Design goal:
The chain has one helix and three strands; from the N terminus they run ββαβ. With 60 residues, it is of the alpha+beta class. A three-stranded antiparallel β-sheet has the order 2-1-3, with no helix packed on it. The radius of gyration is 13 Å and the shape is globular. It starts with 22 loop residues before the first strand and ends in a 6-residue tail after the last strand. The relative contact order is 0.28. It comes from Homo sapiens.
Length: 60
């Protein structure tokens, strides 16, 4: 809105994709979820210590 600069999104905000770099640990959370690039981005944008275990499926 004229700031003319972009803002790291809430992860919720984007999702209906199949560019899955699935499995992302959290370091504090320590559990194996499944994600979009827009998700991974958003996660990395602000916060830190995301580990990519697998490009493609998790531990299921």
């Amino acid at each position: 809105a004229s700031t003319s600069k972009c803002v790291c999104l809430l992860p919720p905000q984007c999702f209906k994709g199949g560019n899955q770099l699935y499995c992302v640990k959290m370091g504090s959370s320590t559990s194996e979820k499944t994600l979009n690039i827009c998700e991974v981005g958003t996660i990395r944008c602000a916060n830190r210590k995301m580990e990519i275990l697998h490009p493609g499926k998790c531990l299921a």
